[PDB]
Structure formats: structure tokens, C-alpha cells
Amino acid sequence: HHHSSGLEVLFQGPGSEFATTLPDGAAAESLVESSEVAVIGFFKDVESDSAKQFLQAAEAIDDIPFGITSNSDVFSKYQLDKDGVVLFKKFDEGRNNFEGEVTKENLLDFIKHNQLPLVIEFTEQTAPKIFGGEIKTHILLFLPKSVSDYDGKLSNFKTAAESFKGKILFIFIDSDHTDNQRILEFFGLKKEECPAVRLITLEMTKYKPESEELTAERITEFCHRFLEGKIKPHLMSQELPEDWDKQPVKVLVGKNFEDVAFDEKKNVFVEFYAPWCGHCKQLAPIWDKLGETYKDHENIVIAKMDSTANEVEAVKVHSFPTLKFFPASADRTVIDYNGERTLDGFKKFLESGGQDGA
Template sequence: MEAAPSRCLFLLLLFTCELSPEVAAEVQESSDGAGGSQEAVWLTDVPAAMEFIAAAEVAVIGFFQDLEIPAVSIFRSMVQDFQDVSFGISTDSEVLAHYNVTGNAIFLFRLVDNKQLDLKNEDIENIDATKLSLFIETNNLHLVTEYNDVTAVGLFNSMIEIHLLLMMNKASLEYEESLHRYQEAAKLFQGKILFILVDSGVKKNERVIAFFKLNVSQLPALAIYHTVDDEWDTLPITEVAVERVQNFCDGFLKGKRLKQNPESEEKTPKVEL
């Protein structure tokens, strides 16, 4: 098998290794269109902060010693932009000490891989709405994360080395029920497998389907991928069933990997897609 860099799949699926200004603008535009009346939750002690983080798939907390700095108002503006993220804010000295914050910081906690990402003092001083929006958007991974040019960065940086992709058209009548069952299956492999949704109705995503040597007529399908050594397997399905997804994942984890890009096959050159 040809040696490949760790987690090369999602690196290949990115247009570039960094977000382009156009993508950054798309993130900001989508955020500006969000509505609702969500508010940041004040976290007044350590137990409250811990409970808040444990209850959310993705939690973003602003730890501030000074509420007058520009970053605070920018942070609060993000609350309305990300309705699927829980926002908290704390000025309590014990809470800040518990999370080793000595100045001002913004942390993102995600349940899917128990990962903590942060913006420290030096980043906070130069933060603006676009930078903070990108930080949240690119790291906003849930039990099931939809693949796109922005979330690919967070997927690529996840510590979870096995990714499961459900490739199906979101416009299909079966989509809502299929997604619900896929989410239920994701709970069974939390911390072990990263569950991803690939909308086959999006033209750009044809490169993902082609990577796994599938075509649209074979969809919906599951594709499971080991990011370290490029081993993968696929399973065309007529419907998404929790037990079917579970058995497919269990088989892969136990080493029953059927398609591994064997050296005997002619491989597509690895270039940016």
C-alpha cells in the first residue's frame, strides 16, 4: 500500500489547506441570516460550568476578566449566529482558574471527540466577528456533521481516526427519518467513529463519492474510512437502519475491511480535489 500522510482524505477534499476569503465570506453571510433569541448562559461556579459543557454537543464559553473589552460584544453577537451551539460566559475567578485561564479566553468544547479548543489572550486582542465565526464554524462538530468546505477543517483535525460517511440526497423523502436513525447509531460509537453526512445532491460532493468508487445509482451508501492508513470499505443500502450501521461499523473495527486500496489496483493520483 502506498504510504499516505495521516488523515489525507479530508485534506484532499479541501480546495486549499486554508479557508479562502470566499469561504470565509460564505460563513459570515450564513451567520448573518440566522435568527432567534438565544442568549449566553452565565456560569457562576465550577459545577455550573461543568454541567453546561457536559449537556451540550458543542459548547462555546467566554472566560473574561474584563467585560469591557471588544471581544465580549463580539462573542455575544455570535450567540444568535449559531443556533446549534450552546454559549456560556463566566467572570468567576474560580471558574477561570479551573480552566487555567489567566486573562481572557474563548473555549470551544465538543462532545463528539471530547476535544477542547481555545483562543487565548493574544488571539482575543485581535479578534473580530469574521475570525470568531470561522473559529466556531470550522470546529463545530456534532454527533453527525454535514461535510462541506468549512466543516472539513474540523473533521480533518479531529482526534478520531475512523470516519463514517452517509452519502445520500438531502432532498429525498427518506432523508429526515434516515438522519434520525443515523444520529441514533452515532451515539453508539461516540469517541470511536466520527459520523459524517455527505449530501449527494451537492455537485461538489461528487468527488467524495468518486473517491470511494461509488456512483449515484448506488446511493444511499455508507463509506467507512481509517484516516491513518487509508483503509476503507463501502456498503450501498436501501435504507438507514441503526442495526445495519452498527454491524457495518463493528465489522470494520474488528478488522473486516474489504476495500483497502490494495497495491495491485491502479490508484487515482492523490491531488487536490
């Protein structure tokens, strides 16, 4: 029903491919209830400049349903005295009114800014957005579902979130679950240490709070301190295995990284990798062949480090695999490698003294 017209189509303005025409209050309620976020343009004249700017906004966005209405009873239903645009949502304030000049770009900005909840649970449903987001600073509340005062601690987290609307994205994650364990590891946390709060910048470090308390005020202080660069970059290390240097490719962890990497008398080539990463798996036999070629060399060292389980300060890695060259010198220079991930490309780079290949 809400997806077909009767004969009203004979005497009303032409509809749009990109927004659902809403004849009445029932149609509007159904549109809002159909999705987590919905937007309705209230335009008496669907053919006006302002309404068309709205329809252009609707055309450009794929994951939010747009509705449009010219019925005064519907305007009234949503406390509208005149033409306007309203975003609806099944969380927080439940509704946001657009203000300013109705243009495609102003509308797109309006949607983007009010579309996301104050606090977002991390799941495989929410993950794509959180990872493809524009806000490049995140705070994670590791909140176990078994733990008591779940509602309370989440409420403290949401309260704190209000102070950083366009600056820090507030995310909470279920520590108890085994599917979230790699994220735990990546932040160097145990389920025992949780509930806890951690923060990450994606342009590229992690940070922990000074206090273990989870009050709105404590989380707020933590965030405010981070923004003032008052908190030092958080580091983590795996235990160095005794066989770290038994193979042609040397195993680095956080603890021994500086020792071998910035050895002044050694040309060190390091693979920073993720164990679960398909591309790292693909490179692995080639990287071993490179290690084998330079097993008995006088000054070239081939090495790797699991960058999901080790955080050093000299280098930051959010892309896997990443390859970096540490020439033999006192300067402690890092040369980025962007050549072909080939046995031959590595060799030519190594014998160049890491001169070329980007």
C-alpha cells in the same frame, strides 16, 4: 449594547479581554444566539481561582465566544445553584454542563468533546474541521437530497452515531451534487448506488457494509464489525488503458499494480498521485524526465498510479504525491522515498539501488 458597559463598571470586578461580561438574562441569550456553539462561565467572584482557570480556557480558544456572569438571576435562568460552566449549542441536546475540577485543561477537554454535532453535514463550511479532526475514523452517509425518507435515513444515522461518540465521526454528504463527485469517486460510488454508507480510517483504508440497508441497527452492526476487524479492506480499480506502457512512464491501475510493482526481476519506482493536486502537477514534468532517462533500461521501471481512483492493499496513500521504490527481489519490499523531488535526487536514489535519501 451587549458590547459596552455602563457605569456598573465602577463597582464590579474587573472584566477580561477573553470573555464577554454578561450583566443579565438578555445579554446571555444574545451571546448564545450569536454562534453555533457558545460557552458561559458562571462565577460570583470573577477574580477567584476557578474563574481565572475559565478565563485561561477562553484565551486559548479562538473560534467559540465565551461569556462570563456574576449575576444570580442569570445563574437561576440556566438552573445553576452555584458556580459552573455551561456549553450551549444549536443542535442535539442544545446544552452541556461541565463537571469536575475547573482547570484550563479540563475545560478545554470538555469543550472539545461536546462542541461537535452527532451528525455533521459535509460542506466547504464544515470541511476544515472534519479534515483537521482528532477522531481519525469516519463513517459517511451518502445521502442524496432528491431521495425520499431523507429525514428518516438521517435519523437512523444519528441514532447509530450515539454508540460511537468518541470513536467514529458520523458525516453525511449530498451525493446528488456535482461538487461532491470526487469524494464519490474516491469511495468508488455512483449516484445510482447511493444512498450508501462507507467508512474510512485516517491511520488507512476504506470499508463498505455487507448489507445495503440503512437502519440504525444495520449501520451499528457495520461499525461494530469494523472495530472487530471483521470487514476486509475495500479496494477499487480504474480500467487499464491499452496504452498504459506506450510512454516512458508506465500507467498503473489497481488491476495491474501487483504485476508490474512486485515484479521480482524489476526495480519499480511508482508515483502515487492526485490529478487535481498542484504539487503532483509540479512534479509531473520532472517525473516524465526521469521516465525518459530510463526508457531503455534493462531493469528500472518508472510508473505512476492515480491514488484517488485506485486502492490497492500493498500500499496506502493519503498524501499526494507519494513516491515508493519496489526493488527487484522475492521479498516484496517497499522502500519509502523522501529525498529531493529532483531529476538528480531520483537518479542518485535509483543508482543506489534505492539505498539512501530520506
